[PDB]
Amino acid sequence: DPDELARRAAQVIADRTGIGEHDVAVVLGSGWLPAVAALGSPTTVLPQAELPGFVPPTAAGHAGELLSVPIGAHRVLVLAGRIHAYEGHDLRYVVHPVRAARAAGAQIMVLTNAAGGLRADLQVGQPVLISDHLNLTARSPLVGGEFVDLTDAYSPRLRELARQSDPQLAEGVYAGLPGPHYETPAEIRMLQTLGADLVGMSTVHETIAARAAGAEVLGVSLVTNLAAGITGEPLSHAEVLAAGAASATRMGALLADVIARF
Amino acid sequence: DPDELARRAAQVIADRTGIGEHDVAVVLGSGWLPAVAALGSPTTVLPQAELPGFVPPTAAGHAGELLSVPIGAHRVLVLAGRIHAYEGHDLRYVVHPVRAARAAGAQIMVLTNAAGGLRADLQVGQPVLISDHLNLTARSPLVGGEFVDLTDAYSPRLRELARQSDPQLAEGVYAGLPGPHYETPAEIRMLQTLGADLVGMSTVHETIAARAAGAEVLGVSLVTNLAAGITGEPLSHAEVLAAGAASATRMGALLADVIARF
Amino acid sequence: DPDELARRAAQVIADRTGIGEHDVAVVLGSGWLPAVAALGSPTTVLPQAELPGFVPPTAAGHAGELLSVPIGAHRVLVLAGRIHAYEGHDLRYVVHPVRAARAAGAQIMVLTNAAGGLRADLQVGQPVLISDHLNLTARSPLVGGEFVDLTDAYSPRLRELARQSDPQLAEGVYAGLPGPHYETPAEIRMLQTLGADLVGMSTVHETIAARAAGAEVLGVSLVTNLAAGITGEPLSHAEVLAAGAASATRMGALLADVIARF
Ligand SMILES: O=c1[nH]cnc2c(C[N@@H+]3C[C@H](CO)[C@@H](O)C3)c[nH]c12
Ligand SMILES: O=c1[nH]cnc2c(C[N@@H+]3C[C@H](CO)[C@@H](O)C3)c[nH]c12
Ligand SMILES: O=c1[nH]cnc2c(C[N@@H+]3C[C@H](CO)[C@@H](O)C3)c[nH]c12
Questions:
Q1: How many helices (H) and strands (E) does chain A have?
Q2: Are C133 and C204 in contact (CB under 8 A)?
Q3: Separation of alpha carbons B217 and B206, rounded Å
Q4: Which atom belonging to ligand 3 lies closest to the Cα atom of C236?
Q5: Dihedral angle at the C-alpha atoms of B42, B209, C191, B191, nearest 10 degrees?
């Protein structure tokens, strides 16, 4: 039962942070690890693994920590690192962090990730707001009778607030694939034909779960590389992390400022 | 064993209805529940849960009953309600009803469903004959060695008979997705590029199983809403059922008239 | 563990063939069974079922044997027949043959298969080099941390060598689907829009596993039929095998000559 698991996790979060309720939750993805400090000074930092239902993150660049940080007038839950479907876990565990955050009081989820850029105007190191997504996993974190509407899944309101922080920000459609292998050039051309501007291996299910649980979502992708075949250069996870690190300053600053505007 | 479980179901059906063999089978989908009255008067009504191999339907608007109704010169098996892949059951259970119907003698399957409309001409409340489908579930109810040809999976002959009943009936390509979450506007634009005119969360596997079993198929979608992003308005299951109810009488009358022409 | 099972299978291969190491591996797919003779005179022939981790092939036209054949200056492992995902096995077993071959020393994998033709200039009986693929199975044979780059997954270098044998060889993008049901005409139109020139039910995962393991790949499809909807004619596995048999002479000769050029 996802509901009870989330409640139990939320209770532990309240007991360890000393805060009965949090207002916003942020998940830092690949390349986003160094952006955690700019969010503010944490009042609590603990291992995600400590929390009920939390499968510890294992991918490089994912700290696997939970931080409670005051940002603006909000108490923010920072999920430094996430698990992915390609790691083999049931989607119940993949979306648990977001559900636990919701049970802890968070009504706004800021989901960040690294992504390959498909639209010609996107450059490596550029943060892109997610306007919508393409779930190409043939799966759903929802089960039986949960008919959730995904119109405005990525709140236009939150994207406008983000632009208030940095009017420069572009938007794009995120394609969520299973992974863990990167795409072939032909698959990238296919994704372009399908309307995708960004490609990654997470987020879509978490967004679906967040909406199903009544929370708004702000998605932010960091273009860590141009999609396969666009340049012809080889992609590697280390390169993804390195690319993300180069924009850590802007990223951390952006998150801190936008969240304060919520 | 699928075949043997289908035979057991067909036998219980014969015993309970007192009819040794049926000629046509109809599966009523979301919103079609109240269309049963217009089909004719049942000689027998029983719970699907009482039939071997039948996983009971659980989605709202799915009665989970089996009726034996005489329509014209045919003895018709009416499967009021169905189970869906999003309910978590293996496909053998999802296509079992159709296989049991075939074992009961049904050589024609009338698969009805609710669907979101993507093509510009479609209106809410409009019945649409399925001309072909797009299986976007990445699954199949068939196993090794079952290399079934899907050309004319939706019998042109039956669509021809349907138009004889209502000359104004339009046709469309149905895209079958996993569900249970509705599609994002971006996914809808993607489906239009893929050639989809209607979008749903059932039917495709049942059609495949029916063809593999040697039965002809007539697919009928009731546009219960325009696809996500077309109107921007929210989608909800209650609304799907409500829309279906507004057209239930017409749908039942249509089915009765078409089937009598078989 | 996949790697351990692979190394173990490789030790058995070495022992039963008396050959401590092989240089090239070739997988013969549907319709390719008779092309084995032209490869050369085998020094050892044994059932795949007798090797660790090898699930026996079951589809008609797949011998299920492993042959050690000297071709040119190379010691070649010939996998006569393969298993498919539609047979229900975990992808670990589907890609095991390739991983075992790599562990046995093979740094080049020649993956052959039967495929439906989508591009208008491709004819039944025509061999087509795979330039790239579209993995439309929503799956991957890899697990967490195995972020493999798939640029040039099908070695341009090996395709060049292939053309030195037959300068008239055409290239095409292969779409890998789950199967086992054949595609609907609407699905074929979709595949064309997605950039597919060939459609099949294997190879993509084996290619991914090969690349992840450090082996180059040469993919060769034999157009055994025009895709569904192109002609309207019925498709069947027997016809696929018959079509393949009609070009077995050309294929066996092609394989023997190309491998000798490696
Ligand atoms: O080109 C790409 N294709 C698919 N995903 C990504 C990502 C995103 N994350 C990064 C990480 C792999 O390096 C995995 O969890 C996917 C960055 N670039 C790409
Ligand atoms: O817009 C749509 N997208 C996907 N499926 C449907 C359906 C069909 N059924 C209806 C039902 C959900 O309300 C589920 O079993 C899917 C109607 N409208 C849509
Ligand atoms: O039209 C086609 N669609 C999908 N696969 C194939 C193939 C390839 N193999 C052949 C075999 C089925 O007959 C199965 O393992 C798929 C040949 N023609 C087609």
A1: 8, 9
A2: yes
A3: 9
A4: 13
A5: 30
C-alpha dihedral (B202, B205, B210, B212), degrees to nearest 10? 170
Cβ pairs bridging A and C (under 8 Å) = 87
Q: Give residue B86's Cα distance to chain centre.
A: 16
Which residues of A fall within a CB distance of 8 Å from C138? 136-139, 178
Range of the domain at B105: 1-262
| Max Cα–Cα distance, chain B, nearest Å | 51
Are C162 and C184 contacting, i.e. CB atoms less than 8 angstroms apart?
no
Is the CB of residue B25 less than 8 Å from the CB of residue B110?
A: yes
Cis amide linkage into residue A178, ω under 30° from 0: no
Task: Report the distance separating Cα C54 and Cα C48, nearest Å.
Answer: 6
Contact C98, C210 (CB under 8 A): yes
The whole-angstrom distance between B127's CA and the closest CA on chain A is: 22
Distance C200 CA to ligand 3 centre (A): 5
Residues of B in contact with A131 (CB under 8 A): 186
Residue A219, CA distances (Å) to A109, A156, A205, B222, C114 in order: 8, 11, 12, 35, 42
Selected catalytic residue, list B140, B165, B237, B239: B237
Dihedral sign, Cα of residue B93, residue B99, residue B101, residue B107: positive
Residues framing ligand 1 (Cβ under 6 A): A 30, 59, 84, 114-116, 179, 182-183, 199-201, 224-225, 227, 235, 237, 240; C 147
| Protein residue whose Cα sits closest to atom 15 of ligand 1 | A201
Structure-token pair, residue A22: 């949090």
Ligand-binding site membership of C35 (annotated): no
Task: Show residues of chain C in contact with B172, CB under 8 Å.
Answer: none
Helices within C25-152 (DSSP H only): 91-94, 96-103
Out of C225, C228, C243, C248, pick the active-site residue: C225
Nearest residue of B to residue C185, measured between CA atoms = B151
The C-alpha atoms of residue A190 and residue C194 are separated, in whole angstroms, by 5
Query: What gap in Å lies between CA B5 and CA B86, rounded to an integer?
Result: 22
Of B133, B139, B140, the CB nearest to C186: B133
Set C6, C22, C25, C62: catalytic member = C62
The minimum CA-CA distance between A18 and chain B, rounded to whole Å, is: 36
d(CA A205, CA A135): 8
Distance B158 CA to ligand 3 centre (A): 28
Query: What values do phi and psi take at B116, rounded to 5?
Result: -90, 140
Number of domains observed in the structure of chain C: 1
CA distance to B30, B251, B252, per residue, from B38 (Å): 16, 8, 5
Q: Which residue of B has its CA nearest to A142?
A: B180
Residues recorded for chain A: 262
CA separation for the pair A183, A186 (Å, rounded): 8
Closest chain C residue to the Cα of A59, Cα to Cα: C145
Asked whether the beta carbons of C240 and C31 are under 8 A apart, the reply is yes
CATH assignment of the domain containing C131: 3.40.50.1580
Cα-to-centroid distance, B29 and ligand 2 (Å): 10
Read off φ and ψ for residue C135, nearest 5 degrees. -85, 100
Phi and psi at residue A167, to the nearest 5°:
-55, -20
How far apart CA C206 and CA C98 sit, in angstroms, is: 7
**Which phi-psi region, left, alpha or beta, contains residue A152 (left: φ > 0; alpha: ψ -120 to 50)?**
left
A181: nearest CB among C132, C150, C193: C150
Pairing type for strands B108-117 and B216-226 reads parallel
